[PDB]
Design a protein around this ligand. Structure first.
Ligand SMILES: OC[C@H]1O[C@@H](O[C@H]2[C@H](O)[C@@H](O)[C@H](O[C@H]3[C@H](O)[C@@H](O)[C@H](O[C@H]4[C@H](O)[C@@H](O)[C@@H](O)O[C@@H]4CO)O[C@@H]3CO)O[C@@H]2CO)[C@H](O)[C@@H](O)[C@@H]1O
Ligand SMILES: OC[C@H]1O[C@@H](O)[C@H](O)[C@@H](O)[C@@H]1O
Ligand SMILES: [Ca+2]
Ligand SMILES: [Zn+2]
Length: 528
């Protein structure tokens, strides 16, 4: 038996909760490290077989010993408890940089020379094309347009919403250009710059991904990976998500990098022209390409996002003719990577009210509220207070969770203020940092039970026991979609369907689009 808690820490002014498996209320105490009790209370039932202890009213910063029954845990309370972990989570993006020297003074053990520097060949042609830069998507070295757009969107949103919190962190500053932009925008620019090179100049269409034809060994260092790079065909989804992301970037970078902003604005417009002239064809891996497909049969949510993004970028009411009918569809309103309608909803809602139909706008806001109410209900019935059900624990469940937390916080910027918003955010972070049935901190390098063996090639290649820090893992996946999970996790409840093993890619991989909602949510909490 043990105490389950936020292993990174708690905010002075934030909610403070711990969990234990018990069958009745027990007293508990928080004590200074010399041992004197500073706070005492009683645990209370929350379902399954869980009790919780609330020590929110302890406001004095320090490292305390939580004791309950015969168990003890070490809990930290601090003004900005999540500053280190947010910085690590943002630095992950720079650790993923492709085609750039990462020096040892910035990147420590994981420093390396520029990787994947060769030109990629366009699929089914002899043509070559340079598209250097950007991020290795995940545990592999491929760069995929569709998930890249979500990661960029999320970082841009975190800058718009929580610039003060983000001002307190430092990326790998010396690998980026001077004069230095604010942290989120500095980091995001490297991906935006890469995305721009994935657009076909002749048509406006965007290539779906650039990868080697297959995955290299788990042991491969990035600079050792010398297989030819292949540009997979142009896709509707890539072109639409590129459009939306570039349109978002055009607005955000206006006062920071006017050349980039103007360049993104025009690229978004050329992408949208491509969408207008082409069919909504789902992407499938071409033959001889075995890397991540990032396919998606439903493409109207991507068009929605592209259209709403351009609406807000231009402020032209003309775009609302095409947006508002897409906003009426029964699409799921989610934050990607495949179901991206809520990004579009947010662009629509953050457009000047004069540019849109007031009728439609209030209906959109009403639906957003009903959605949040539904998520809030899930959270009430869950023992750890997270907006999740057992069936939500799929591949990348940590992202499912963080996107839901993100939705509550995004809504507060568009006049939909749900009372559960900040509780949900705190519970999400608590869960991510150890307040779960496995007592598992799902970020590398933090907490008392960190992730130690992520499915991540740079980590596997150097030290298989000490990985790159600040990486958020996929989390429990009840579908057991790799050999290690099938072997070791059959019959376990959904939230326990995780294993810290380097070969469990379906529960223990990492991704730029899993760090990006975590950056947003943790930034929100830091803005205390
Ligand atoms: O199965 C029932 C359940 O499915 C839900 O959709 C899930 C789906 O189950 C799952 O297979 C899929 O997993 C994706 C994952 O989202 C994606 O992040 C991951 O990305 C890989 C990539 O393919 C690799 O190239 C690489 O670089 O690593 C990354 C990170 O692991 O790939 C897998 C498989 O392609 O996720 C779906 C969600 O989009 C349904 O939503 C639900 O309704 C069903 O009940
Ligand atoms: O199914 C996709 C998975 O395949 C594995 O072989 C790769 O190592 C992972 O990077 C990838 O997520
Ligand atoms: Ca879609
Ligand atoms: Zn690379």
């Amino acid at each position: 038996k043990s105490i389950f808690y936020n292993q990174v820490g708690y905010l002075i002014s934030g909610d403070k909760r711990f969990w234990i498996q018990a069958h009745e209320p027990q007293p508990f105490a928080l004590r200074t490290p010399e041992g004197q009790a500073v706070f005492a209370g009683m645990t209370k039932p929350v379902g399954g077989n869980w009790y919780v202890g609330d020590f929110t009213a302890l406001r004095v910063p320090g490292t305390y010993t939580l004791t309950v029954g015969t168990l003890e845990a070490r809990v930290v309370i601090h003004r900005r408890a999540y500053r280190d972990v947010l910085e690590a989570m943002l630095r992950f993006f720079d650790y993923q940089l492709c085609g750039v020297v990462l020096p040892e003074d910035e990147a420590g053990p994981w420093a390396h020379g520029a990787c994947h520097t060769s030109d990629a060949k366009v699929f089914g042609t002899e043509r070559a094309l340079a598209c250097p830069g950007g991020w290795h998507d995940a545990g592999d070295y491929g760069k995929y347009t569709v998930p890249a757009a979500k990661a960029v969107a999320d970082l841009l949103l975190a800058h718009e919403y929580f610039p003060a919190a983000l001002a307190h962190v430092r990326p790998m500053r010396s690998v980026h250009r001077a004069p230095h932009l604010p942290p989120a925008l500095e980091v995001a620019r490297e991906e935006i710059a890469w995305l721009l090179t994935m657009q076909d100049p002749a048509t406006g269409g965007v290539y779906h991904k650039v990868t080697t034809p297959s995955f290299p060994p788990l042991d491969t260092r990035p600079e050792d990976d010398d297989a030819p790079l292949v540009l997979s065909p142009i896709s509707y989804a890539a072109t639409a998500t590129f459009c939306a992301a570039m349109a978002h970037a055009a607005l955000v970078y206006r006062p920071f990098d006017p050349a980039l902003s103007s360049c993104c604005a025009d690229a978004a417009r050329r992408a949208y022209a491509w969408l207008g002239a082409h069919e909504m064809q789902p992407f499938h891996n071409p033959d001889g390409i075995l890397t991540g497909e990032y396919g998606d049969a439903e493409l109207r949510d991507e068009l929605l996002w592209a259209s709403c993004a351009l609406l807000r970028m231009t402020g032209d009411s003309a775009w609302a003719r095409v947006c508002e009918p897409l906003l009426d569809l029964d699409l799921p309103w989610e934050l990607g990577w495949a179901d991206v309608a809520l990004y579009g909803v947010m662009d629509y809602l953050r457009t000047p009210r004069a540019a849109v139909s007031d009728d439609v706008r209030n209906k959109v806001k009403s639906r957003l509220l009903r959605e949040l109410d539904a998520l809030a209900a899930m959270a009430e019935s869950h023992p750890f207070g997270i907006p999740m059900r057992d069936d939500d624990f799929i591949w990348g469940s940590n992202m499912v969770l963080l996107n839901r937390a993100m939705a509550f916080l995004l809504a507060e910027g568009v006049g939909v203020l749900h009372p559960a918003a900040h509780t949900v955010a705190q519970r999400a972070a608590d869960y991510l940092f150890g307040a779960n049935p496995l007592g598992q901190c799902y970020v590398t390098g933090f907490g008392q039970r960190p992730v130690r063996h992520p499915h991540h090639r740079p980590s596997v290649a150097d030290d298989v026991d000490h990985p790159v820090p600040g990486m958020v893992v996929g989390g429990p996946n009840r579908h057991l979609q790799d050999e290690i999970a099938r072997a070791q996790l059959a019959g376990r409840p959904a939230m326990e369907a995780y294993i810290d093993h380097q070969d469990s890619y379906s529960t223990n991989e990492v991704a730029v689009y899993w760090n990006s909602p975590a950056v947003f949510v943790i930034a929100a909490l830091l803005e205390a």
